[PDB]
Design a protein around this ligand. Structure first.
Ligand code: HEM
Ligand code: HEM
Ligand SMILES: Cc1cc(N)nc(C[C@@H]2CNC[C@@H]2OCCCCCc2cccc(N)n2)c1
Ligand SMILES: Cc1cc(N)nc(C[C@@H]2CNC[C@@H]2OCCCCCc2cccc(N)n2)c1
Ligand SMILES: C[C@H](O)[C@H](O)[C@H]1CNc2nc(N)[nH]c(=O)c2N1
Ligand SMILES: C[C@H](O)[C@H](O)[C@H]1CNc2nc(N)[nH]c(=O)c2N1
Ligand SMILES: [Zn+2]
Lengths: 404, 402
């Protein structure tokens, strides 16, 4: 074999070599001495080289590498950087870079869909109010009455000196998290900080378990402004179970649209600090993490009690049984509501197909095993048995500091 | 820089400083993380030896004593003359416990101080190896009240072949490859089954035929030894409420005993040093019975449960897996054979991380192996960051002897 990482599938006994990792510019958190793979948290001349590299990627993707148009765009980019210190992407370059950033995302199991992304260009936006209009349009298009469509809206890039466009909320849809007198939390504990920031900026808080938060939107060098989403814009699914009649009595619900709004989209050195993207949910994200994490809605015990399980001993597997039923209720309720959702078996089978597509197309696929393997029934899915090489390619979605 | 390690459920942070003591490299580089991969002179020996002897005297709080200095002279003198040395029994005992302590893939390390060490370094034939192995099995099994143990056969020597146990575990069920591709029994054991028959074993034709042991003394053909059936404790599987489950005819053995790993202590290598503890129920319930390249019983159990098999979104696979794990726990408890479920095991591992943080400043752990194969995020270890690195004494993989 070659001197590239050898990658094995233990289920099928098959082997590949990852040659794509050679294209990595960015270092990750690991060294020869220690593996830091499980950690959740890991320009003058520098811009020019990142830009040249991205332009080469674009021209390859359209099979015009070395062409006259290829060499003219390079010269354009460097002249523009030369005189202004920055440059600007053509429309088709943005659409390509956005899809490529998704394609490159090591933590996303949904990447079979990567070629099918609606890219809304919002680089003309000049106020917080217009951001809100763009965001509402995104939500309407992406939600599509339950037939969900992948989309991203890109706001103006970071510019020298001038402040950033930022969406303060981590997602477009978030449930409030209200800190109680006794120190417990009503609603989603994930959202305590953003909830209190919303109140500080003049939001009148509710007191339910599922109050949709307003958006805090920030245009360059301005205090963020507060915007309420019209309720008919935010599609939600009430949760019921196919055979357990009492489950509907719990009043549990989840929203249809997962839309990450706090990540930075980096393309050819340019930095799009507000560039929210959305897909559709994998059912374990709702039924396992959001509803059963101890530091989230934490409903496992309640459901076990309703199911009359022995919750006094770990060896009854009460946690596993309840968690299965919660996941089934999520899948069942979304299917009844006609809202797009994918189970962890179907999602992981499709990610294996993606790995095979990418092996042929690029000679590898960066992938974060701990994120790709679902949080229940792990080894029951084909990805558990698949070794994965994790590395950072650009274009990329990156974490960025909170604006406050 | 020392790694910041965060628990995401509790919000707490530690720093791993133990990692600085790592001397051997892992598969990863700044360019790419390879952590999910299952497989990877005298002055050199002298450094590993001294460092290990240092570890030993430090552990008995006699660091710098007469005894410490003199032992370092012995080791130095013996290496300088012969190119190698020998461990004192008490050092061996210390190094074996430490190798387990250091094992990043082991979720059971809260137990690391409780290990019975059988010194089998005066072994000179496959016959004697078999005697030592039977004593281990008998001690460790203890009629179902399992006790962790290791037996250590003679170290590798420059001038000769290794002592080896050919089998990957001391108890393995045969896998018989059918002309038409399929396997009867355990597909993981097809290769060892064929090696046994080829060395003269009369094979069975069942799904759970216990394999003989192929034991190898240095530079000799391996020898075949049938384990006496009464030494191998087994648990028939039934389900607490599903009557038909027993009818599947399923069973597993009590004793998980790995026999193909190399034990490295102070630069010395023990090519045969089988070790055993007790099972975590997901090893049997989830991996051994439900892996598609193992016994692969998921579909059969689902049909028996009358589940909707036609679509993944009924979560039939998840439901069947739960009942199978429940049946393993129930059946082991009923037979009074030591077992631990994945919730209790991971809880104890969290306590271990905390013990090791105070004791040593960190703990090497392989997240992909520590998190159980079902209900990952339902256990506390899912939410815990972990640093993986190699400390010595160590258990390592080694080439198959054939
Ligand atoms: C089409 C439906 C999609 C499915 C089922 C899907 C599935 C997932 C899942 C299950 C995760 C892990 C989430 C978690 O553990 O909280 C994830 C993370 C990710 N996904 Fe996808 N995804 C989809 C569409 C998209 C789209 C359209 C983009 C971007 C264009 C994207 C980029 C990412 C990124 C950047 C992460 C990591 C987020 C982070 O680290 O916070 N996904 N996705
Ligand atoms: C006390 C009872 C024990 C329990 C519940 C336990 C638990 C486990 C589990 C669940 C695994 C992963 C196994 C797999 O996925 O196939 C494992 C691996 C390991 N354990 Fe422990 N263990 C115990 C005792 C021991 C002892 C006594 C030693 C050494 C003396 C040890 C050393 C290891 C090593 C070296 C591995 C990795 C094996 C490999 O890479 O193939 N374990 N153990
Ligand atoms: C700082 C930071 C930002 C950021 N975006 N993500 C992290 C990692 C943590 C780990 N758990 C919460 C947070 O990640 C949330 C990721 C939500 C992804 C949701 C999503 C997006 C698109 C499609 C889909 N099915 N699902 C940290
Ligand atoms: C070459 C090689 C050797 C070796 N010992 N292990 C591997 C890793 C593969 C992954 N799956 C099969 C093999 O591992 C077998 C490990 C069994 C662990 C048994 C055990 C020992 C002690 C306690 C316990 N609960 N369970 C590979
Ligand atoms: C510490 C650990 O890396 C952390 O809990 C990770 C594990 N795997 C994950 N996988 C996904 N998809 N999402 C997550 O938030 C996490 N959390
Ligand atoms: C490819 C992947 O690393 C492989 O399937 C691992 C994952 N985690 C594991 N964890 C344990 N405990 N045992 C295993 O065999 C494995 N297999
Ligand atoms: Zn790594």
């Amino acid at each position: 074999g070659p001197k590239f990482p050898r990658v094995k599938n233990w289920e099928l006994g098959s082997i590949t070599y990852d040659t794509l990792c050679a294209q990595s510019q960015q270092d990750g958190p690991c060294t020869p001495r220690r593996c830091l793979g499980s950690l959740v948290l890991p320009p003058a001349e520098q811009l020019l080289s990142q830009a040249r590299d991205f332009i080469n990627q674009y021209y390859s993707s359209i099979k015009r590498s070395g062409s006259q148009a290829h060499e003219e765009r390079l010269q354009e980019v460097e002249a523009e950087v030369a005189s202004t210190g920055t440059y600007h992407l053509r429309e088709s370059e943005l659409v390509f870079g956005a899809k490529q950033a998704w394609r490159n995302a090591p933590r996303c199991v949904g990447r079979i869909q990567w070629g099918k992304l609606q890219v809304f260009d919002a680089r003309d936006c000049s106020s917080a109010q217009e951001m809100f209009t763009y965001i509402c349009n995104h939500i309407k298009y992406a939600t599509n009455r339950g037939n969900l469509r992948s989309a991203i809206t890109v706001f103006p890039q970071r510019a020298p000196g001038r402040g950033d466009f930022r969406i303060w909320n981590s997602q477009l849809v978030r449930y409030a998290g209200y800190r109680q007198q006794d120190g417990s939390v009503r609603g989603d504990p994930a959202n305590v900080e953003i909830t209190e920031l919303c109140i500080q900026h003049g939001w009148t808080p509710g007191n339910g378990r599922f109050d949709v938060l307003p958006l805090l939107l920030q245009a360059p060098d301005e205090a963020p402004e507060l915007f309420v989403l019209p309720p008919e814009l935010v599609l939600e699914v009430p949760l019921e179970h196919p055979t357990l009649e009492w489950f509907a009595a719990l009043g549990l619900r989840w929203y249809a649209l997962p839309a990450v709004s706090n990540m930075l989209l980096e393309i050819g050195g340019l930095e799009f600090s507000a560039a929210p993207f959305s897909g559709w949910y994998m059912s374990t994200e709702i039924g396992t993490r959001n509803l059963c994490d101890p530091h989230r809605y934490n409903i496992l015990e309640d459901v076990a009690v309703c199911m009359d399980l022995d919750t006094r001993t770990t060896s009854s597997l009460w946690k596993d049984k309840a968690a299965v039923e919660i996941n089934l209720a999520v899948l069942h309720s979304f299917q009844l509501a006609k809202v797009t959702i994918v189970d962890h078996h179907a999602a992981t089978v499709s990610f294996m197909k993606h790995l095979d597509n990418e092996q042929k197309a690029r000679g590898g696929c960066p992938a974060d095993w701990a994120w790709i393997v679902p949080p229940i029934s792990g080894s029951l899915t084909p990805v558990f048995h698949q070794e994965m090489v994790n590395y950072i390619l650009s274009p990329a979605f990156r974490y960025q500091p909170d604006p406050w």
